[PDB]
């Protein structure tokens, strides 16, 4: 799987929906083929790898124990209730897998709000005791760079990896361990509807003429004022983002957003 040359990435899937992996497939300039053939060596990834079963497990072992070192990218929260049994791969708990692998990585990136902060399965009443990577593994000294969102902008993953490869260090991180170069501004301070907010020009309903005219979505629940992300600037898929589609921000790059930002249609 890897030896010298391209840096090795081990990508792990815990309690996740695979939306974060799908977001990486949307990479643009560079595209995912460039990333996997030229930039990096993707040495374990359950969604796309050829090997299955015992051969997949052997691929993982080969990558993790390589003398060349690896970077870990982690998708999903870690279920910790009941000694980890709510999530297993190859009959090992996700908790055990990550506890064994992540301390061996040269660097760890927690990709998506589930891996960063616990995410959707950690919302009340959290039946599986899901935790974000740094919370679950604090005791082992794991300090993953957190790239939040549900899913994040893949621009933010690639940018973080490129930085790390060039500088051999993490970029500047905020108090939630997120890179300031992507997460330094609120969604709201970047939003094209900000002049309507300032004027108290709010859409009262989605069917309203005010909504049709593009008035501010705050009365309809927009969490842009309390959410750190680069959505209005970079957009998604090179073309759109929630408020430009007429829908409030739901706060998806913030910790505990499922409980903190709900009801989604109120402020």
């Amino acid at each position: 799987l890897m030896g010298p040359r391209r840096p090795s990435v081990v990508y792990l899937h815990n309690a996740e929906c695979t939306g974060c992996s799908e977001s990486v497939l949307r990479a643009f300039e560079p595209y995912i083929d460039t990333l996997i053939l030229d930039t990096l060596s993707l040495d374990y990834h359950e969604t796309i790898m050829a090997a299955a079963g015992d051969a997949a497990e052997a691929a993982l072992e080969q990558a993790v124990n390589s003398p060349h070192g690896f970077i870990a990218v982690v998708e999903g929260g870690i279920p910790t209730a009941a000694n980890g049994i709510y999530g297993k791969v190859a009959n090992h708990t996700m908790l055990d897998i990550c506890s064994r692998i992540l301390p061996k990585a040269q660097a760890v990136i927690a990709y998506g709000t589930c891996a960063t902060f616990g995410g959707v399965q950690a919302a009340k009443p959290n039946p599986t005791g899901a935790k974000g990577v740094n919370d679950a593994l604090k005791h082992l000294g794991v300090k993953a760079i957190n790239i939040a969102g549900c899913p994040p902008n893949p621009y933010n993953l690639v940018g973080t990896i490129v930085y790390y490869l060039k500088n051999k260090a993490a970029p500047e991180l905020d108090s939630l361990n997120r890179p300031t170069m992507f997460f330094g501004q609120t969604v709201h301070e970047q939003c094209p509807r900000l002049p309507h907010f300032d004027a108290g020009e709010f859409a009262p309903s989605f069917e309203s003429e005010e909504a049709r005219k593009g008035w501010c979505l705050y009365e309809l629940g927009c969490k842009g004022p309390v959410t750190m992300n680069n959505c209005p600037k970079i957009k998604f898929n090179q073309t759109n983002w929630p408020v430009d589609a007429g829908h409030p921000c739901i706060g998806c790059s913030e910790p505990d957003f499922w409980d903190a930002m709900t009801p989604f249609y109120q402020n």
């Binding site: 939306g19 080969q62 007429g246």
Partner: protein, 534 residues
């Protein structure tokens, strides 16, 4: 080398989510199977007590592969509960985004999830690109030259020579494998198109974001309609249309020809992985309250009796837990559903999965493309009949061939082709509606204190239903019954094997250390375990 004994595949890769397949093999053929889903999240538990308007945002995170589908199902469910009839344009926009999702999902499935079960990428290095180009040009109206394919070979050679095989590390085909049949040239064509599809899928997904904000996890649906006033503009419509046209061209000129070339080479795969019973919910409505207004109609078939398609009765669905990691043994209709986790470890008390086992009139039902296609065919759907008949004729097989792993894989392509064309019809209808002066995209509604609702989506993997009981204006109960739950759930309290389990009986295994035949069948169902368990 005719093996007897167990085989375990854990993880099953090139699916969404966390699946363990166990089989017993006798004299080289599978005689028994278990489908074990090994992650639980508990979204139904999490939803209790919340605002019904919030459900779609949580449930969309059931799955990012079949992104949008659960948002659509939850919004249809709450729409239904509150009795709102969304505007025509909201139906059009929601339908167009769903059509786009089908094209994205199926293209990625065939190339990026399924094809490495049949394509030896490393054998492409031995190929003669000139011969390969001649073959590629004979199967598609898109002409391909030797230099086109040599560029792919050169890139692959550099990659392989680095000794860092990445996602091909320990592939079942490395070194050769008796169950891998393609010649070098066909392997090169498929590998070239695998790589092409990595960039084409960017466009296919972008089509969803044009109206739907972003992919993954769209953000344009509300109870009562959609939010995207920009979707009415000629500029956004034109943007969508261009992405759709390019995606459709890839379906027609790249995917379907490759599907047919591979199927022809693997025609023995008509003999494995059949199933008995089929369920489908229909999709692409004209009327949100009438499933028979959908472009594909609902139906139920038992024991392959396509002359006697039964109506779909939503009250005949029950979800079993006897062989699942939940409390007790009592099957429940989803309006009376229960999600009470109780883990017993593998085969503890005869339980082996986090999926429930949905049964329709007590029977295990395959859902997904094969169900959609076969039921539509049998209802006289003219587009499905035209494409299916042309596929059969090209392969030189009769209709009985469809009841197989090969058949299921072909059906996925058929549905893709038919939906790709129908997106254009929906798009024209939408344009015509705007031109009549209808600019409405959302309708007002009121939350009842007590209600029941259900939403139905035929998603890329089949019949999806979301079920709500509203109590005091909050979520009293919310139950998801998801396509992969039907297909890949375990046995029920009558001990009936699920579709995937049944379909594996009879699978030949040439090399138990590299059991690609199991993967071929399992992957033909396009498993989504986050979906199946939630």
């Amino acid at each position: 080398s005719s093996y007897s004994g167990p085989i375990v595949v854990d993880p099953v890769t090139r699916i969404e989510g966390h699946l363990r397949i166990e089989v017993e093999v006798e004299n080289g053929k599978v005689k028994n199977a278990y489908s074990s889903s090994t992650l639980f999240r508990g979204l139904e538990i999490i939803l209790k007590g919340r605002d019904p308007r919030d459900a779609q945002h949580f449930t969309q995170r059931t799955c990012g592969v079949c992104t949008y589908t659960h948002a659509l199902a939850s919004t249809r469910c709450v729409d239904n509960a509150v009795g709102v009839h969304i505007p025509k344009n909201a139906t059009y926009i929601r339908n167009l985004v769903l059509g786009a999702q089908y094209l994205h999902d199926h293209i990625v499935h065939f190339y990026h999830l399924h094809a490495l079960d049949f394509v030896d990428v490393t054998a492409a290095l031995k190929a003669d690109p000139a011969k390969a180009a001649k073959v590629a040009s004979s199967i598609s109206p898109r002409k391909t030259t030797a230099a086109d394919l040599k560029a792919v070979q050169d890139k692959l050679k550099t990659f392989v020579e680095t000794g860092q095989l990445g996602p091909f590390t320990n592939a079942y085909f490395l070194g050769g494998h008796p169950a891998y049949y393609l010649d070098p040239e066909t392997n090169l064509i498929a590998t070239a198109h695998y790589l092409e599809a990595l960039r084409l899928q960017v466009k296919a997904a972008r089509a969803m974001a044009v109206f739907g904000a972003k992919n993954p996890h769209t953000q344009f649906t509300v109870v009562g309609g959609v939010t995207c006033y920009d979707a009415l503009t000629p500029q956004r419509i034109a943007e969508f249309e261009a992405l759709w046209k390019e995606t459709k061209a890839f379906v027609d000129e790249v995917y379907i020809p490759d599907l047919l070339v591979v199927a022809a080479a693997y025609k023995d795969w008509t003999q494995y992985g059949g199933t008995d019973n089929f369920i489908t919910f229909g999709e692409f409505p004209k009327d949100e309250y009438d499933l028979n207004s959908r472009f594909f109609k609902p139906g139920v078939v038992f024991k392959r009796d396509f002359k006697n398609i039964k109506p779909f009765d939503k009250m005949q669905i029950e979800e079993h837990v006897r062989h699942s990691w939940y409390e007790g043994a009592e099957a429940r209709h989803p309006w009376k559903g229960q999600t009470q986790p109780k883990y017993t470890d593998l085969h503890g008390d005869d339980r082996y999965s986090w999926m429930k086992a949905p049964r329709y009139m007590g029977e295990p039902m395959e859902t997904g493309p094969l169900a959609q296609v076969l039921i539509a065919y049998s209802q006289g759907h003219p587009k499905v009949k035209a494409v299916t008949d042309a596929v059969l004729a090209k392969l030189g097989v009769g209709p009985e061939a469809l009841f197989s792993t090969l058949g299921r894989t072909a059906a996925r392509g058929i549905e893709t082709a038919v939906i790709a064309e129908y997106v254009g019809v929906m798009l024209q209808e939408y344009k015509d509606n705007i031109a009549k002066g209808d600019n409405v995209i959302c309708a007002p509604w009121e939350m009842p204190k007590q209600a029941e609702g259900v939403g139905f989506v035929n998603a890329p993997r089949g019949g999806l239903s979301h079920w709500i009981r509203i109590e005091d204006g909050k979520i009293g109960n919310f139950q998801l019954v998801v396509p992969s739950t039907w297909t890949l759930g375990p046995r029920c309290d009558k001990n009936k094997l699920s579709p995937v389990e049944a379909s594996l009986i009879g699978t030949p295994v040439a090399d138990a250390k590299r059991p690609v035949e199991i993967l071929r069948t399992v992957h033909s169902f396009d498993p989504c375990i986050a979906c199946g368990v939630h």
